[PDB]
Scaffold this active site. Structure first.
Site, PDB file in Angstrom:
ATOM      1  N   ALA A  82       0.820  -1.207   0.000  1.00 41.94           N
ATOM      2  CA  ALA A  82       0.000   0.000   0.000  1.00 41.94           C
ATOM      3  C   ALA A  82       0.856   1.261   0.000  1.00 41.94           C
ATOM      4  CB  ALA A  82      -0.943  -0.005   1.213  1.00 41.94           C
ATOM      5  N   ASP A  83       0.396   2.250  -0.762  1.00 43.82           N
ATOM      6  CA  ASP A  83       1.083   3.529  -0.873  1.00 43.82           C
ATOM      7  C   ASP A  83       0.427   4.553   0.048  1.00 43.82           C
ATOM      8  OD1 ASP A  83       2.764   2.541  -2.926  1.00 43.82           O
ATOM      9  OD2 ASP A  83       1.082   2.689  -4.264  1.00 43.82           O
TER      10      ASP A  83
END
Length: 75
Positions: free
Chosen positions: A33-34
Site C-alpha cells: 500500500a502507498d
C-alpha cells in the site's frame, strides 16, 4: 468494534479479506500500500468515525492505525 470498522474500511478500500488484515502486520508492506491507500483509509475512517487519525508519520500498521483512531475517538 472500532477495529471492526477500520477493518471494514481497509477490507472494502483494498478489497482484501478481514482475516488478511492483521494488527501486528503493516499494510503498506503486507498489501504493498502507498500513501494514497493509507490516505484514503484514513479519509474513510475520518468520514466514518471522524476522529483524530494521525498518519503519514510512521503509521502504516493496522495496530497503530486502530490504536490511534480508537484512542483518539475515545472521550
Amino acid at each position: 468494534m472500532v477495529f471492526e470498522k477500520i477493518q471494514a474500511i481497509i477490507v472494502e478500500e483494498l478489497g482484501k479479506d478481514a482475516e488478511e488484515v492483521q494488527l501486528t502486520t503493516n499494510i503498506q508492506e503486507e498489501l504493498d500500500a502507498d500513501s494514497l491507500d493509507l490516505f484514503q483509509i484514513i479519509n474513510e475512517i475520518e468520514d466514518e468515525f471522524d476522529v483524530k487519525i494521525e498518519t503519514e508519520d510512521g503509521i502504516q500498521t493496522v495496530q497503530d492505525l486502530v490504536t490511534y483512531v480508537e484512542k483518539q475517538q475515545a472521550n
